[PDB]
């Protein structure tokens, strides 16, 4: 066959395993037949171009559908009352009741109500008409075409880059820090000053107007005279109606701090100043590394030079330059870990400090965004650790990393893993024990016997940031502190107004329930890290299989020889860490959603009192809030939440189906499929038809992967349905 053109070992397989493995190994270029390093890098480059084109097309489709089937123009008028519609529904299976139930948003045809917040985002950017969205979609289609053409072009013989170019670290770092990050944020500041702020103040600025419309009455004279403070005078009044000129100011750059009163989001002038400042900072950072001129550093020199003279790190960072530059998996792991941390930060900061107008009052949108980004963060962290393990298996060179930090990590992997296991057991034992203690005492009717620990440390941090709810009087809660006196006339007034009002999610009040769930989150993070770190460090070998690197990253097992070797691979460590990562993110999003739901309905006491025992979570969060969702459709009718109820049950179904693959293993199914093949061959009128690929049972690793995928899809879809439907049915 020539299906897996990249593997004759698969092309010559006479079973369906060929098709399955050709699917699952299509993007492992390193393992493909006759793969050279140059071809590997050039294919990755072209694939990146295609991926960027896909992203541009996806955003273009969002914009186009919101422009065509959306209600953006009538949403920009009363954004707090109009529901934003994502796209129209055309399903030939809907009944008239379903069409009527889904006809909402002020439109006259069934629609989906967006939970992505793109409406608020674009409104804040400066989009007001559907023509603006359509023009944006056109531009993104053009950009997708440009990037597809670039990907095709850079695969041509005279345009294919070389490896001396792919491994040029200094120039890439300089350009990414200065232009991709720095100048890009500077351009975003330029946009926010030329379009977003005038649009927020009711003055339309576009391509036909921006070359004649001054962003500031003084023009650029304050900039070119050094009187930069003139750009902060006359900010927007507290009675500014976003999108109109009533209450507007003339400032373009400020540091008011806090939130705009009406929109309840960060000041657009503050955002513009933020982006300008980080832009110049990044432009400066991008001039650090040496390029075709004499100035700059060399990363190899810095790494080799950095070795503490005490010798507690050995050779320090010698050889890491070559290791990282020659290992794409090391780079992939670093990038994935950093992006995962940044997306968690995006989630954590975007709910505490909303940046888009009126987004804070779109409760379902906020919960959906937070859950989305936390799940993405967990996926990225699991991927970072998996690719670290793959690097250890494939790209690690001990002789090169003779007694540097990496070799030392491998040296005391036993200590690392044992201490990680100890801290995991510590956290688990005691967190679960406190939860069970509270459960039992409350069950016996003695809630006063609960062990409720005040998160005094987090409360102290809040008070330091300026929260007066708790009496600590530390740094910014203290009016006579140096910290207060330093920023009293820049941002502290607004920041204190924001922090000390209970209208926002900025530094929500915390209690013993928060303490307990936080230590549950700590347990989850530590156990996921335990599994992933153990997989990465034992990937090359263990006492059971001291030659694992020979077998690779994702082999099934080593047989029942030494007492059993099931799940003895780093891939299997990843497979288990994915259950644990799904468990931890579930805990995190449960905590977030319940706290915010209780605050939104104003009964924060319900969380404060029921979060201390697991029956409280099971009853007052899941059981209590599942009512509208499970009533989406019922014997007496249906509403728009019927789709979410259906997806809820869909997630349950696929989750339980994944249980099949995870519990039942191959031999049973292989002996069953044998009988099935016998039956087909000896059935008249059906033996006229014959399989071209011998029907076989799924492989061990394949079954693990399929069960994991089913489990993950059930997890994600069930919680998406629950969160969105419950939020939409309660508010």
């Amino acid at each position: 066959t020539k299906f897996p053109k990249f593997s004759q070992a698969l092309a010559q397989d006479p079973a369906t395993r060929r098709i399955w493995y050709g699917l699952a190994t299509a993007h492992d270029f390193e393992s493909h037949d006759g793969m050279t390093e140059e071809n590997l890098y050039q294919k990755i480059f072209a694939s990146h171009f295609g991926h960027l084109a896909i992203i541009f097309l996806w955003t273009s489709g969002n914009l186009f559908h919101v422009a065509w089937q959306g209600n953006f123009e009538q949403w920009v008028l009363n954004p707090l009352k109009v529901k934003p519609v994502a796209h129209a529904i055309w399903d030939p299976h809907f009944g008239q009741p379903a069409v009527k139930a889904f006809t909402k948003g002020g439109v006259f045809y069934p629609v989906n109500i967006a939970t992505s917040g793109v409406y608020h985002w674009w409104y804040t950017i400066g989009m007001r008409t559907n023509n603006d969205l359509y023009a944006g979609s056109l531009f993104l289609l053009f950009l997708s075409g440009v990037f597809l053409f670039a990907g095709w072009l850079h695969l041509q013989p005279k345009f294919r880059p070389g490896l001396s170019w792919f491994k040029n670290n200094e120039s890439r770092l300089n350009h990414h820090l200065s232009g991709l990050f720095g100048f890009s944020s500077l351009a975003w500041a330029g946009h926010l000053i030329h379009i977003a702020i005038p649009e927020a103040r009711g003055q339309h600025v576009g391509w036909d107007n921006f070359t004649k419309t001054l962003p500031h009455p003084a023009g650029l004279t304050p900039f070119f005279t050094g009187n930069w403070s003139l750009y902060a005078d006359n900010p927007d009044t507290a009675n500014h109606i976003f999108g109109t000129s009533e209450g507007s100011g003339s400032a373009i750059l400020t540091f008011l701090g806090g939130f705009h009163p009406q929109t309840q989001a960060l000041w657009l002038t503050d955002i513009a100043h933020h982006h300008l400042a980080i832009g110049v900072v990044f432009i400066f950072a991008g001039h650090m590394y040496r390029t075709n001129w004499g100035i700059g550093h060399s990363l190899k020199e810095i790494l080799d030079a950095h070795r503490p003279p005490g010798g507690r790190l050995g050779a320090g960072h010698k050889g890491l330059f070559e290791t990282i530059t020659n290992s794409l998996h090391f780079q992939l792991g670093l990038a994935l870990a950093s992006i995962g941390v940044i997306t968690s930060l995006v989630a954590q900061h975007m709910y505490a400090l909303p940046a888009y107008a009126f987004i804070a009052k779109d409760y379902t949108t906020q919960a959906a965004l937070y859950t989305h980004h936390q799940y993405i963060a967990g996926f990225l962290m699991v991927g970072a650790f998996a690719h670290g393990a793959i690097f250890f298996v494939r790209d690690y060179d001990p002789e090169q990393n003779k007694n540097n930090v990496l070799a030392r990590m491998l040296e005391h992997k036993e200590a690392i893993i044992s201490h990680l296991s100890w801290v995991s057991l510590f956290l688990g034992f005691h967190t679960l024990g406190l939860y069970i203690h509270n459960d039992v005492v409350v069950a016996f009717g003695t809630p006063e016997k609960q062990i409720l620990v005040e998160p005094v440390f987090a409360q102290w941090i809040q008070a330091s940031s300026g929260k007066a709810l708790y009496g600590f009087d530390v740094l910014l809660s203290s009016s006579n502190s140096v910290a207060t006196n330093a920023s009293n006339n820049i941002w502290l007034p607004g920041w204190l107004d924001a922090i000390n009002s209970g209208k926002n999610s900025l530094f929500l009040p915390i209690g013993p329930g928060d303490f307990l769930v936080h230590h549950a989150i700590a347990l989850g993070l530590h156990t996921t890290a335990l599994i992933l770190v153990k997989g990465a460090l034992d990937a090359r070998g263990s006492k059971l299989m001291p030659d694992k690197k020979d077998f690779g990253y994702s082999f099934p097992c080593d047989g029942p020889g030494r007492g059993g070797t099931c799940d003895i691979s780093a891939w299997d460590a990843f497979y288990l860490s994915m259950f644990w990562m799904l468990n931890t993110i579930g805990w995190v999003t449960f905590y977030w959603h319940w706290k915010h739901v209780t605050i939104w309905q104003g009964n924060a006491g319900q969380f404060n009192e029921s979060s201390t025992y697991i029956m409280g979570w099971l009853r007052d969060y899941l059981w209590l809030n599942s009512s509208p969702l499970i009533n989406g459709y019922n014997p007496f009718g249906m509403n728009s939440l019927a789709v979410w109820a259906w997806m809820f049950l869909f997630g349950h179904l696929i989750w339980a189906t994944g249980f099949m693959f995870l519990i039942s293993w191959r031999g049973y199914w292989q002996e069953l499929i044998e009988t099935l093949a016998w039956a087909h061959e000896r059935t008249p009128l059906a033996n006229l038809v014959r399989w071209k690929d011998k029907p076989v049972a799924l492989s061990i690793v394949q079954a693990r992967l399929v069960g994991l995928i089913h489990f993950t899809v059930g997890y994600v879809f069930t919680y998406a349905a629950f969160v969105i439907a419950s939020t939409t049915g309660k508010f």
């Binding site: 295609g50 422009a67 008409t129 359509y134 053009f142 997708s144 095709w152």
Partner: peptide
């Protein structure tokens, strides 16, 4: 508010992008 001519221009750009995507897919498959 979005006219059929606007939608047709969008479709033409989408078709151009599809042609380029097929070209890139071929080049990558090689």
């Amino acid at each position: 508010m979005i006219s059929d001519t606007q939608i047709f221009v969008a479709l033409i750009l989408a078709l151009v992008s599809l042609v380029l995507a097929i070209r890139l897919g071929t080049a990558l498959y090689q």
